[PDB]
Each structure stands twice: as structure tokens, then as C-alpha cells.
């Protein structure tokens, strides 16, 4: 056997495990909300004594 | 033919086990020169 085989027969299934791990990441959305405050009315009021 | 291929499957499930443990496949290659030897005979099937 050679030194390279050797080394690569040194890893073994039980010798060597690989797993794979991934971290949940929520999708990303694009979203446009628009706010405009209540409508506002003039108002014109003449007070007087016989009123 | 078919005897000797039979001893062929065989040889293939060897060698998916020789891979596993990286030891050199030397009866593999002894093997393989036995299903050589077999896949002349084959050719010769193949032509009758």
C-alpha cells in the first residue's frame, strides 16, 4: 500500500461524518404603505348678541 | 459466459466495498483480469 492510499484509507465512514446545517431565513418582502392624516374642513362662524 | 458474468456482478459489489474502506483494490484488478479473460469469451459469444 502506498503512503497517499494509505491516508485516504485512514478516513472512514464511521472515522470521518459529514453534515450539512442550515440556518432558517425568512423571505425577504418588498412592501409600500402610505398614511395621510384625516381631511381638515374651514370653518367660518360670526357670533352675535341677538344671535 | 454467463457463469463468468455472474462472478462479474459479484466483483462490482467488491469493489463498492474497497472504495468505502480506501484499500487498494488489488483483487479487484485480479478480478478484472479474470472478467477479461471472460469478456474475450463474450466476443466469442457475441459472434456465434
Known sequence: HD??????????????????????????????????????????????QWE | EDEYDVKYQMYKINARGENLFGLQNQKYPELEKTDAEIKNLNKLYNLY
Open chain 1, 3 to 48: 503512503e497517499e492510499a494509505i491516508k485516504q484509507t485512514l478516513r472512514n465512514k464511521f472515522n470521518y461524518n459529514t453534515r450539512e446545517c442550515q440556518t432558517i431565513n425568512p423571505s425577504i418582502r418588498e412592501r409600500g404603505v402610505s398614511t395621510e392624516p384625516p381631511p381638515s374642513d374651514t370653518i367660518c362662524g360670526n357670533i352675535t
